Design a binder for these strands. Structure first.
Lengths: 197, 333
RNA sequence: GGCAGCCGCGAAGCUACCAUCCGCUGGAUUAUGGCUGAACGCCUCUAAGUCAGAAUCCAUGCUAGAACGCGGUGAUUUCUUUGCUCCACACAAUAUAGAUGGAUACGAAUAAGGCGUCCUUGUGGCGUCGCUGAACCAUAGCAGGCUAGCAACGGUGCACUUGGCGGAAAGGCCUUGGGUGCUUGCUGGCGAAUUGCAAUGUCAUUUUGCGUGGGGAUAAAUCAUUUGUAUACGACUUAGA
RNA sequence: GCAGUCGCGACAUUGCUAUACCGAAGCAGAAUUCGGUAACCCUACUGAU
RNA sequence: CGUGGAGGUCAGUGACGAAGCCUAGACCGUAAGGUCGGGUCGAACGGCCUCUAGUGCAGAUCUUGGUGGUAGUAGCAGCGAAACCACAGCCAAGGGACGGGCUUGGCAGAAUCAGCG
RNA sequence: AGAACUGGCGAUGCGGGAUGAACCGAACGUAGAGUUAAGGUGCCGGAAUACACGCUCAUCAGACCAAAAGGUGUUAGUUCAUCUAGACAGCCGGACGGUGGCCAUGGAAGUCGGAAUCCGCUAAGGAGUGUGUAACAACUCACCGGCCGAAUGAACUA
RNA sequence: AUGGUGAAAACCAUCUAGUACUGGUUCCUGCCGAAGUUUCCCUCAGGAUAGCAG
RNA sequence: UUCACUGGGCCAGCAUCAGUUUUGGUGGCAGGAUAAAUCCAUAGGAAUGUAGCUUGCCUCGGUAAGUAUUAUAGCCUGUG
C-alpha cells in the first residue's frame, strides 16, 4: 500500500511489533522503525532485567568472545528480537533483513514524513489497565546505553519547532476550511452533497 | 599479568593518543586540557619533606624524576565534534593555513620525492578576503559545544633525528564555546609555552608507550597521580637552580643524557618515572578529576638536582668541579 | 705478551623484595530501617507511591579497536600518447529481493483527547468531533495530439531570481519578482481505425565504455640505500632535487 | 532403630541403645555467638602478514 | 538386457571406412541396454530362430600396473622421499542408549608465518 | 524377578511431535482435481493476533516424582452462629464488696509459686489474659453500658 | 610325515588347493512371501519333528 | 513452374457440453405447546412503587419517608 512504512515504536509492544514487522518484511513491505528507545515491554522492570541477565550469562561456555554479542542499544535489541522471528542464514531472510531500518528517535528525513502505528501492537490496547510494564529506554540505559540523555535532548529540540510547524499547518488548514465554508451553499456544492461529496 | 592490560598486541602507533578528557565547566575561562613532550632521560632529585604527620616530617628525601622536553607547541587548526546517538562525529575542521614543512613531511611518507604540493589550493581560501573561515566559525558556534584544537611540536628545535612533527588534539575547558572559538581565532598560528597551562606542584597523569623487550612490551600505558616538580624554560636563566643550591647550571648532566641530546630548552620535571624510553613522545593530561587529597595539595621545595654524568658512574656534578679538583693536566698544559 | 687464560676494576646489555614511581570515583540496587496508606472503618516499610544504603550491577577511567562500523581534512598524475575530474548531448551493455499517482510530517495520556469561539487568559466557560485511513490533493486530452474564444490572473511544469531555515544520518523546504507551456473553470474546429477479439505489448532506475561540447586540477604511493625509538621471518620508524 | 502413649493415624511424646554490611543474646567497653546479602593431534592458545 | 564361441538365415554391414574410443548432442524403454548426429581410428563386424559358458563387480585389511594430497616437506643455490589418507574440521543444547555430517541456537571474513602450550 | 495373551518392531515407507526405534493417525504403482486423520492456525510455519465464559504476576510461572502441609496471595462453594430486641469493627465509660481468701515467706495482695478456684450484687465483672512497680500503685482483655451504621465472624471444601 | 641343505635362532620341493570361524559372494523387471517356534528323542553338542509360506 | 488454399507443427481465447469438486443468491414444502415469541382483549398481583394525597425539609415550593395497584408511567401472572 506504501513503498515505505514508518512505524513509531512509542507505546508499542516489542514482541508484537517485531512479529508484524517480520511478517511485512517477508511479504516484501519496506518498514523503518523510529523512536525505538520509547518502546515498552510487558512485565516488571526487575523481571525484565533478570530475564536479560540470565540470557547475557548464557552467552557461551566454550568461548565468551566467540559467543553472542550483547547489544545494549534499544534499536539493536529490537533488531535481535525481530531476527529471532526470521529464518536467518537463508538468502530470502538476508534479503528481507535489508528492508528493515531501526533508529532511536526520529532521525531525518523520516522526521519530515508521516509515521504510522500498528493498533494490534499498542500497550494501551493490549495491556490491562494498572499492570506494570518496562521501558526499553530504561532497560538499555540500565545495561549500558550511554546515549539516553542525547536522545531525549535532541527529541525535545525537534519537538521545538515541530510545535511551530504544526501551528502553521493548523492555521493554513483553518483558513482553507473557512474558505470552503464560505464557498458552500453553491449549486456545485449542493450537487456534490447529493452524490456524497 | 592483569587481564585488563591484555591482549599483548603491539601498540597501534608509537605516538600514544589521549582517550579521555577532563570534565568541562560552562563558566570557567579557556584552558588547555593536555600537553605533549619527549622524554629526555631521567635524573635524581633531593627535596625537603614538609608533609605533616609523616614519619620523616621536615626531613630531606631523595627520589628519581623524569625530564620531558616540551618546546613551544604551535596550533594549526580547530575541530568541532557533534554528539549523536552514535557517538561523537567530526562536524568541521578549519586549519590555520600556516602549515610548516614539518607537518608536510609528516603527511608525506617519502617527502624527499614528493612534489610538496600539500596545502596549496586550500591556502587561497585564507589568502584573500575569505569569509569562508568566518562562515565555518559561525557554523561551529551554532553547532556542537565541544571543541578540540590541533597542534604540533617544533621538532626542529628538539635535538632529535626524527625531524618529523606530530599532530595532537587538545580540548579547551572554557565555557560559552563562542568564547572558545573566538580565542582560537586570536590564537591561530600561535605557539603556546609550557608555563601557560601547568603550574608547580600540580597533579597530572601521563600516557606513553613502553619500551619493547622482545612480543614483550611495546604497548600504550598510562601512569596517573604524578606531581609536577619544575617547569624550566630556555629563556629562564639557570633552569636547574633551586632556592638552596641556586647553582647557575642547567638540568643537562655532564656529557648530556645517555642516548639523548643535551637539552637546553623548555622542559618539565615531574614525580616518578613516566613510561616510555628516551626520545619517546608522551602526553600529559591535567587530572581529569579534581582530587583533593593532601598528597595532591602538598607543595614541594626543590633543594638540589643531580647533574653528574650518567654514562658510567658520575665523578662530579659540573664541569667546573672536575678541572678544579684536578688542578692541572697534561691534556691542558 | 704479536697465539690461550688469570688477577682488580668496569660501563652497556642480561636484569631484581636486592631497587625505583603509581594503582580510579558517580549512580541503580537487594538485604535492612522508616514515610505516607486501605485491603480488614483500628494497625501495617508495600499492595498504588516513596527516603538511604552491600565485597551486587551499571557507569568514569584504563587496554585493544569491527582490518567486512563511521565523519572531516591536504595532495589527487600538463602525460597512463589532452592524459585525468564535474556537468549537458547521442549508442550500447548492466542488471533490478521487484513504482506502475502521492512514504499525505506537532507533543503527551488512554479512568482521556483534540477543532472553533469568548474573556476571567486558566487544570476557565460554551459547541462539536472520533466510534478507524471506506480517510485528503489529484485523477477527462494519441501513455494524453494540432487549433479558436469566454470568465478569472488564480493553479501548475521550466530554468531563473532575494533571503532564511534544516548537523541526527543536516544534502531538503518555504518563499520574493518576471518570463515562458498547459490550465479539463466554461463553450468550439479536426487526427484516432489495420495491433484486424488480447498477448507487461514496452515510457522507471544502478553503474560502466566507446564519442561531441562546456568548466577544473595537473600529484602521489611501493621498492633500493639509509636509518632505530624493533625484531623470530614479515612488520614497524626515520633521511637524502 | 524397636516399642507405647495419641479402622486406617499429622507434629509433638516416654522407655533402651576470609573480609564488608544488617537484627538480636543480659550487646556497660572490647571481644564473642546466632540468622541473611555469599566469597606430523581436531577446537586450540597468542604474536603477526 | 549384455558378452566369448557354435549351428541356419538376412543372396547382411564394411577402404565412398567395421570394431574400439571420445562426444556440457538427439531419440527408444520402468530397466539391464539399443539406436542415431559430430572428431581419431584402421580391416573386420551386426540383427534374426537355436546350443554352449572360464559370461556381467563397488569393496573381499583382494590380485597385476599406474596415478593423487602428504611435498617441493624431511633429508643431503641445487637434488629430493617415506608413513598416512571413506570425507572435512567452531561450539551450547536434546538425542529419553552413539553423536562428527540429526535437530534447535550463537555465529562463521579469503589466504598465510611463527613460540609451543 | 517368573508364568501367560494380545498389538508395533522385526521385514516398515508417510503426516505431527524442536529431535527419540516403543507416542496418535496411516500401511505404499506413475499423475491431476477435491476432502481429511493425528497435529496445528503470531513469526521461523502452510492456517483466525477467531468468537464466548474466568482464573495467574510467577523474582528463571505455563506451554512437561519425595509434598502431607503453610502463605495478612487471589477467587468461588458447604456447616454453625449473631442481625433494625442493633452483623464485625471503631471511639468513650463501668470493669465490684467480702479479699490483702489459705499457705511456702521480710513481700507474690490477680500476674516468682500450690491447692481451690469460695460466696454476695448485678449490666458484668476471671482470687484475674498481660504490661509493671520491692508488694501495693496505674493501664488492661473478656464481660458489660453510651455515638456510627447491616450483614459479619468462625470451622471446612475447592 | 618323506627326501636334501648349512651350522657357535633353521631352511628347501611334495602329501598340501590337508582339520570352522572372520572376510567376500557380480545384470534388470513383475508376482507371492513368512518365520522366528509346538513335539519327545531330556538338553548341554546336532539333527529329527510340527507350523507358516508353495 | 507463379503465388494462394488446405492437411500438417509451438501457445491460448470464445460458446455450449460429459465426469469430479468448491462457494453464493432465491422459491415451495411437513414437524415443535399444529413452535414458543410478539401483538390485541379481560381479572387480579407486586415493587427496584408511575400519577395523585400526607408529615420533616435545604434549592425559590424544593427533596426523604409513608400512603396511593394506574391516576399525568409501565411490569408480571391466569385466560381467550
Amino acid at each position: 500500500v506504501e513503498p515505505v512504512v514508518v512505524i513509531d515504536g512509542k507505546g508499542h509492544l516489542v514482541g508484537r511489533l517485531a512479529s508484524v514487522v517480520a511478517k511485512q518484511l517477508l511479504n516484501g513491505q519496506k518498514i523503518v522503525v523510529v523512536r525505538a528507545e520509547e518502546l515498552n515491554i510487558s512485565g516488571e522492570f526487575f523481571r525484565n532485567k533478570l530475564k536479560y541477565h540470565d540470557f547475557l550469562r548464557k552467552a557461551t561456555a566454550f568461548n565468551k568472545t566467540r559467543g553472542p554479542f550483547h547489544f545494549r542499544a534499544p534499536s539493536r535489541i529490537f533488531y535481535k528480537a525481530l531476527r529471532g522471528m526470521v529464518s536467518h542464514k537463508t538468502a530470502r531472510g538476508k534479503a528481507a533483513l535489508e528492508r528493515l531500518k531501526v533508529f532511536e528517535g526520529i532521525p531525518p528525513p523520516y522526521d519530515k514524513k508521516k509515521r504510522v502505528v500498528v493498533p494490534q501492537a499498542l500497550r494501551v490496547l493490549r495491556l490491562k489497565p494498572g499492570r506494570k510494564y518496562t521501558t526499553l529506554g530504561k532497560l538499555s540505559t540500565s545495561v549500558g546505553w550511554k546515549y539516553e540523555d542525547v536522545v531525549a535532548k535532541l527529541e525535545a529540540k525537534r519537538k521545538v519547532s515541530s510545535a511551530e510547524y504544526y501551528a502553521k499547518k493548523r492555521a493554513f488548514t483553518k483558513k482553507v476550511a473557512s474558505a470552503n465554508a464560505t464557498a458552500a451553499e453553491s449549486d456545485v456544492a449542493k450537487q456534490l452533497a447529493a452524490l456524497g461529496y | 599479568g592483569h587481564l585488563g592490560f591484555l591482549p599483548r598486541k603491539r601498540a597501534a602507533s608509537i605516538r600514544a593518543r589521549v582517550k579521555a578528557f577532563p570534565k568541562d565547566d560552562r563558566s570557567k575561562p579557556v584552558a588547555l586540557t593536555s600537553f605533549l613532550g619527549y622524554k629526555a632521560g631521567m635524573t635524581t632529585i633531593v627535596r625537603d619533606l614538609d608533609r605533616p604527620g609523616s614519619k620523616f616530617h621536615k626531613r630531606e628525601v631523595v627520589e628519581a624524576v623524569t625530564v620531558v622536553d616540551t618546546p613551544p607547541v604551535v596550533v594549526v587548526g580547530v575541530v568541532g565534534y557533534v554528539e549523536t546517538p552514535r557517538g561523537l562525529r567530526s562536524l568541521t575542521t578549519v586549519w590555520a593555513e600556516h602549515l610548516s614543512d614539518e607537518v608536510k613531511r609528516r603527511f608525506y611518507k617519502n617527502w624527499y620525492k614528493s612534489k610538496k604540493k600539500a596545502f596549496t589550493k586550500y591556502s587561497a581560501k585564507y589568502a584573500q578576503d575569505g569569509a569562508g573561515i568566518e562562515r565555518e566559525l559561525a557554523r561551529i558556534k551554532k553547532y556542537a559545544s565541544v571543541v578540540r584544537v590541533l597542534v604540533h611540536t617544533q621538532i626542529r628545535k628538539t635535538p632529535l633525528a626524527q625531524k618529523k612533527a606530530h599532530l595532537a588534539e587538545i580540548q579547551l575547558n572554557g565555557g560559552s564555546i563562542s568564547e572558545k572559538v573566538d580565542w582560537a581565532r586570536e590564537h591561530f598560528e600561535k605557539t603556546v609555552a609550557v608555563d601557560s597551562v601547568f603550574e608547580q606542584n600540580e597533579m597530572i597523569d601521563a600516557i606513553a608507550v613502553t619500551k619493547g623487550h622482545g612480543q614483550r612490551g611495546y604497548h600504550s600505558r598510562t601512569s596517573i597521580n604524578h606531581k609536577i616538580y619544575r617547569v624550566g624554560k630556555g629563556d629562564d636563566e639557570a633552569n636547574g637552580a633551586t632556592s638552596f643550591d641556586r647553582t647557575k647550571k642547567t638540568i643537562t648532566p655532564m656529557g648530556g643524557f645517555v642516548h639523548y641530546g643535551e637539552i637546553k630548552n623548555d622542559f618539565i620535571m615531574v614525580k616518578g618515572c613516566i613510561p616510555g624510553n628516551r626520545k619517546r613522545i608522551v602526553t600529559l593530561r591535567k587530572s581529569l578529576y579534581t582530587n583533593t587529597s593532601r598528597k595532591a595539595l602538598e607543595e614541594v621545595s626543590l633543594k638540589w638536582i643531580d647533574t653528574a654524568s650518567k654514562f658510567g658512574k658520575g665523578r662530579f656534578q659540573t664541569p667546573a668541579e672536575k678541572h678544579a679538583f684536578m688542578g692541572t693536566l697534561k691534556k691542558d698544559l
